[PDB]
């Protein structure tokens, strides 16, 4: 709305590697996340196809399409409730203390639903899981929602 945030246009100049002021359709998922929006990858996929837009063939962009797609994704930020994120992992391990065994969270984050690479899974556990093999998800989900 501007509140006209012109820093979204300045961040589009940091993600366009050619400097022509266009951003390919394959970068739009990760740049919506870098502007403070977490649409799921199936949602980013649907919307695209919904608009008869094929992410399979070469794509370019213009700021005039990327701005309204970020504004259509911005209504879905009401789905980001931290009660359900901590209660999900509290149902994932027994006893009254928030600890996932290391390999349980790593294999679930790579193979269940939207596949996260094991390189990204190791980069998200690095520091929050110590050598006991127990990830405290009270501080883990706190630090994941700090970015």
């Amino acid at each position: 709305s501007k509140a006209a945030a012109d820093d979204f246009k300045e961040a589009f100049l940091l993600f366009d590697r050619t400097g022509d002021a266009k951003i390919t359709a394959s970068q739009v998922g990760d740049i919506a996340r870098a502007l403070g929006q977490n649409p799921t990858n199936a949602e980013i996929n649907k919307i695209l196809g919904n608009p008869s837009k094929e992410e399979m063939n070469a794509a370019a962009i213009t700021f005039e399409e990327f701005l309204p797609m970020l504004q259509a994704a911005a209504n879905n930020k009401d789905q980001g409730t931290f009660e359900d994120f901590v209660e999900g992992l509290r149902v994932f391990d027994k006893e009254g203390n928030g600890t996932v065994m290391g390999a349980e969270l790593r294999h679930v984050l790579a193979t269940l639903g939207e596949k996260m690479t094991e390189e990204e899974v190791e980069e998200l556990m690095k520091g929050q899981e110590d050598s006991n093999g127990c990830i405290n998800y009270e501080a883990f989900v706190k630090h994941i929602m700090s970015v």
């Binding site: 998922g29 990760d30 919506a32 996340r33 870098a34 929006q37 977490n38 649409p39 799921t40 990858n41 199936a42 949602e43 789905q79 980001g80 359900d84 994120f85 999900g88 679930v108 984050l109 193979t111 269940l112 639903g113 939207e114 996260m116 690479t117 990204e120 899974v121 980069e123 998200l124 994941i144 970015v147």
Partner: protein
């Protein structure tokens, strides 16, 4: 452990000493509804993750920014130098030093 995943009704089944028990076609119906309900619940929980996942990649990419350059330029030098008289000289000589 397997049933851990899936946007499936975690109700409709039941385990026991030699086997699992499963509904169809009602309980079958239940689950289905359930299934959709996790895509929601799930699909949404996936996203953030996905999102978040790459959000850490940027923090790494960025860190890396210079360490590369350092590496980048640094090599190039050598490729140029290693063929230079003066540099070979310094090389044989570099040891006699203290």
């Amino acid at each position: 452990k397997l049933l851990g995943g899936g946007d499936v009704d975690h109700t409709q089944y039941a385990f026991g000493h030699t086997k699992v028990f499963f509904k169809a076609g009602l309980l079958g119906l239940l689950e289905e509804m359930r299934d959709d309900k996790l895509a929601e619940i799930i699909t949404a929980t996936q996203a953030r993750c996905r999102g978040f996942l790459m959000r850490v990649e940027y923090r790494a990419m960025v860190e890396r920014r210079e360490s590369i350059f350092c590496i980048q330029y640094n090599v190039r030098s050598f490729m140029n130098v290693k063929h230079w008289p003066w540099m070979k000289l310094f090389f044989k000589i570099k040891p006699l030093l203290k």
